[PDB]
Amino acid sequence: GDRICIGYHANNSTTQVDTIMEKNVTVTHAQDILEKEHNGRLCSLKGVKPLILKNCSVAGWLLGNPMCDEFLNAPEWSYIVEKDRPSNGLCYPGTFNYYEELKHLMSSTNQFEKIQIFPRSSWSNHDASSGVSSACPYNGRSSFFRNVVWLIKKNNVYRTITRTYNNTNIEDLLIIWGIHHPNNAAEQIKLYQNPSTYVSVGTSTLNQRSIPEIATRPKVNGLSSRMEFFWTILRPNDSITFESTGNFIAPEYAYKIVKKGDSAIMKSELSYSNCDTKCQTPVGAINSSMPFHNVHPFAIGECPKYVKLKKLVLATGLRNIGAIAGFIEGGWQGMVDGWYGYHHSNEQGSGYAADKESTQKAVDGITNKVNSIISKMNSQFEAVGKEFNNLERRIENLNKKMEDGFIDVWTYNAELLVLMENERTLDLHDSNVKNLYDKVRRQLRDNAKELGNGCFEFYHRCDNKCMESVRNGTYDYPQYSEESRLKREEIDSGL
Amino acid sequence: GDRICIGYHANNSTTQVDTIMEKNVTVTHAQDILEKEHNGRLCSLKGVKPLILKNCSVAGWLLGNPMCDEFLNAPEWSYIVEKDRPSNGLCYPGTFNYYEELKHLMSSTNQFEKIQIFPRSSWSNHDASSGVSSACPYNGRSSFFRNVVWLIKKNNVYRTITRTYNNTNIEDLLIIWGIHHPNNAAEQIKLYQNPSTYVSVGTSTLNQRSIPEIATRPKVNGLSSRMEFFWTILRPNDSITFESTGNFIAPEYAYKIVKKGDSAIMKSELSYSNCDTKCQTPVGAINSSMPFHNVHPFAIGECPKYVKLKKLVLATGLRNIGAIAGFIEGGWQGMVDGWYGYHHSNEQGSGYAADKESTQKAVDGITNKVNSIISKMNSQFEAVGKEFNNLERRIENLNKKMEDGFIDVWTYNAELLVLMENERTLDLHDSNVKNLYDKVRRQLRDNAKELGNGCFEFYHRCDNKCMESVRNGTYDYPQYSEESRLKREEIDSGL
Amino acid sequence: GDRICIGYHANNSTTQVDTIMEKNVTVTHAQDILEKEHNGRLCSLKGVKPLILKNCSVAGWLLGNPMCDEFLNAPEWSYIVEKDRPSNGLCYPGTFNYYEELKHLMSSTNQFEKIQIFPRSSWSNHDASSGVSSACPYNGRSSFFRNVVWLIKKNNVYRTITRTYNNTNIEDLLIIWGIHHPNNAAEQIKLYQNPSTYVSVGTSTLNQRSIPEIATRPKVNGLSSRMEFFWTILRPNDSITFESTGNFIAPEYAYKIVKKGDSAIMKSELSYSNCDTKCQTPVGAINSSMPFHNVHPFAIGECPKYVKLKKLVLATGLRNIGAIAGFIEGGWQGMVDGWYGYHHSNEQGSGYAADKESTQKAVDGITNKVNSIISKMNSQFEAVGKEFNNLERRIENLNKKMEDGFIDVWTYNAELLVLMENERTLDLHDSNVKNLYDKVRRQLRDNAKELGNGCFEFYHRCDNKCMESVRNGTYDYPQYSEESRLKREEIDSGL
């Protein structure tokens, strides 16, 4: 009899962590940091709903393809949702210059206010109502983009247009016009009389003469003619003037950029649901509680950081061991109010008291190390949506290499952080147990025999009063020194 | 007499590793991970040979400059080899719009099948044979690109061309045509009669009128006229139609894109050799066995990862120490079946038995740590070839900064990994030796005297039977306890 | 009496370092590595002054807007300083094609030599003096760009111009011309007679017909006409020829690129001062001594590496503890010639001698670890200035994401390096103290009692002669063995 042991926590847990050295090492306590689930819905962003384009494309919406709903209310939006291949684009076929730049401008835009600038009924000198085509049905009749006017000769005359708009607003105006490319010479005269036409646009920044390119082309949604659209931003106190002798597709409405800020054009097939998040991905939404996730790289909002991994587990507590009679042999399921502690074994004592002078000091630096690593990735790379046309392959791939490039880097960083500080977390516990022992060993010196398993046996009488002497760094050799010098002489001369 | 020592491996090796702390530290065992050699040849890629353009440029090949060999067999290729400054490009001088994009499309292309679409002999209404020039010799005569036709007025007439090709294939067609820019008004009429011409191309995606730009230019390979080429991809079930009144350089053959996949345009001066690899660089080929290399950044195939370093050496074993009588003093050349072990010294014994209960457990986590680091760079940045024209300097440099940017990062990563896990590999060995000792010390307690060099001297009689008691965690104090309590009393009272 | 203690340095220092584990840990010795100050001036770069554009823009300078000073001396420059929004650009309004590419070419250019190529007085057939406008005042009169000529019909005639320059220099020539876009048909005839004009330019690389685009535009600095400029580099032994029938803005002077090399276009509002640096930022200059700084990302010269941090402190020495009687309790302010050492306490001795066999060996690997980390970031990402026009937003943001992307990475790297090697630096010190103890313990074995605080008490007589026996790894048990075996028997049998 008359013993004392130094040991560590153990418990029912089976959570598993990894290090540089070892795979799958069971631990008392561990915290997962990788979000891997999503809700498959398309939610609003902290109260603010997305602009859902339905089966339409940004060009369809802006130009007002008869198939796409105007947004009469002038709403703000948190992001824009476009299908992967929308069906309602340029219903009348053609091209839309610097389209992918316009889309990129939408990503920093949060609210438009549509405003009339040239009212459709103000083109006295031309036919403002025959410009419709079979390619643009609204309710089965022939129609046309709501937001632009296809001007056509009135009375076999086409008087040269010169018209101007002064932008008297505080905001930037986004303005869109177009020019018509007929398929033969006979049709050019049929529509605009003058055989040779142009479309001129002037602002202080932009000067452009546009000319009708007549070619023989396949049928797209029915026609072989084409229509090419342009666009520009008109700054406040600047004016724009158009002049043409034909082929001019004039704007009726402009778009007040009224709210800039964080936004995005997400490509997704989903539709809206009565729901809200702090983090949206194209395939659903994320419970942004954990610091990392692997659901999708193109997440927007207040999001955890994306890493290409399948799990990522911090270690916070000991390894998990029975495990009897001191630390050399494992940990004590019977310790519960700490991680490292002791075991009494006295004339009166039972055992199992914890040294939270070093257990709090360890839960101290552990949960302080824990989100100091979470915060050291606050600067991590968050990817951003961009699009490129068929003649921009090189930089599309430059952009791809760049975004995958950083994601691989930050993934490497994330993993190496966990593996390394895992190994240092466990290496800490051991040294903590191992110093508990020593704090006892350098108190009880002569008066006890090191038993080689992690316990000491007393060359004196202990009492419970004094077994707090050793826990508290209190025990003093002299007051039990003589009683021990006695008995060790007697084992020396025992049986 | 009556001793036992705890010591470690040492041997003839002189391999040197580095850490954060120290340079050039000799070790028992080490493994190099940096490939630094190449074979200076240009080999096939795992059975599949490269398309070697010889003295020609991608434009020369595609257009079929009379100097460049057609590839009649329609071969597939693993990569494309272009000289740094080929001599057979546009032999007739001009430009080739979105050339560097076309080159980039080749990088994802593995096989072409050339196919006739407008047979040279089907232009009844024009002269299909006078379009040759002194700038394009084949066998010293005047000639011209094999794959396009220089159409010229037949009989002082040039009837307006309108011709169409429906792409009835499953594959994408790559199609190339051109327009002629004469040097004076008199020559334009000399060749095409009509003073004012155009070249119109239509597909469902592309609409383009092209117009002859007459200027006065220097002589390039003899001429002052110019020729500008265009190109487009015609998707299946789409058609293309050309129409012109002159200056039209019509396609004869199109290129079926038949195999897409991994490929590349390597710039190299070398030529092919009877040889094969899994990794090709522009300056030769690589024995892809090791995980890193430093031969060249633009390597293709199944390649080790490029890092800008001169050596990179993993440490796997101990430091390298004579080194006599226990671990405090160095390692034992005489231990051979392990890394850590013991030394007998008995009434019968010699010494030098290894504790492979902790030597296998160390060769365990070492070669497991070894390629866990190799695999943690499986996601590393691999650079990709791209080209940019003289007006694309900014993004050419963006691309350069990006690729050097990641290579510096990954090089830093690679080195810090080795240095750090080197320091933890050696720090492991020491703690392994140092725990061998303790496993012995906590067995033999009273019955032996710690000699301070790493050995114990027995206060009892040992025998070989029992010196496996201490190796095997077997030795039990009581069965030799009385014989020791005897003698230590007698040194206490000896001489 | 008769003692000896093992302890460590401590001193007046209050410098604070951080690790993964703990914040704000005081240390004996530490070195700051983050430059955070600048001088707010704009200095020369190692003797070589910047080209200060004052209120002008690169286009103003090159074209020689009457408001911008020519640089008659043909100076070289280390960098170029442009205000954020200069006031002297195209005073005559228009555009300047591939402007941001030209600016990028300046960044690799260090010296121009302006040279006449078409002397203003050599246009016999046209009016070379009426081309001035109210938009370009010099000293209040009407004027025009010094470096180009606005050619205007002489005598209601405009004979077709064809003029050529052979570049007979070793250097690349930078050449700039322009074309005039009038506001109405009547003005085009007023200035150039011929109603329909063109501007043709030929080199071996460039072929271009330019055509006057007449539109109705707002007034910029007074006018509604516009002027569009072009530019090209003419390589040596190549020639260029222009021809026009009107609207031609002809070059007078060209720019010999005479010195290429490292340079930059810094945007800054500052002006020059009598001052020099090795590192310039847009907001001032940097004492490039430390390895990292956080003043500004766009620093040029021989600069420390930019990291987005507020402090970065290496730990080099111990923690900072009174701290009495051995290492278990703290460090000794009284040790001064080392970091770890001893304390005598003898029949004659006082104490406090240092073991610089392990103190030099620690100042060894510490200052070797110190700039091995500084040198492991020698490859770090240095950002580079680039500009993009309003239709290049996507790649402008690609470039921004890329540069912030690497800066976040390298900042993470920098911090993790310090935190981790800080923790290993302190963890070293402790193990160094802790091995000092042991080197003593395994010498003095039986002959001393471990006192549990870090000191030993001698079972024999020591003398100063022998207390170097223990410092020097010299002390040998036998020569004091008998005197100790005596007294320990007497404590066993003492009071």
Ligand SMILES: CC(=O)N[C@H]1[C@H]([C@H](O)[C@H](O)CO)O[C@@](O)(C(=O)O)C[C@@H]1O
């Ligand atoms: C602008 C114009 O001419 N519109 C006309 C269209 C188009 O010509 C075709 O759809 C080809 O564009 O043809 C109509 O019969 C129709 O579809 O109602 C009459 C209409 O006025």
Ligand SMILES: CC(=O)N[C@H]1[C@H]([C@H](O)[C@H](O)CO)O[C@@](O)(C(=O)O)C[C@@H]1O
């Ligand atoms: C298309 C054409 O006109 N080809 C003719 C060429 C070219 O005119 C010159 O090489 C300048 O292009 O001149 C020839 O004497 C020749 O070289 O055989 C006759 C030939 O028919």
Ligand SMILES: CC(=O)N[C@H]1[C@H]([C@H](O)[C@H](O)CO)O[C@@](O)(C(=O)O)C[C@@H]1O
């Ligand atoms: C090239 C030209 O015509 N220059 C003339 C200018 C410009 O016409 C206007 O500034 C509009 O460009 O007008 C003047 O009265 C002037 O300002 O001295 C005469 C001068 O010769």
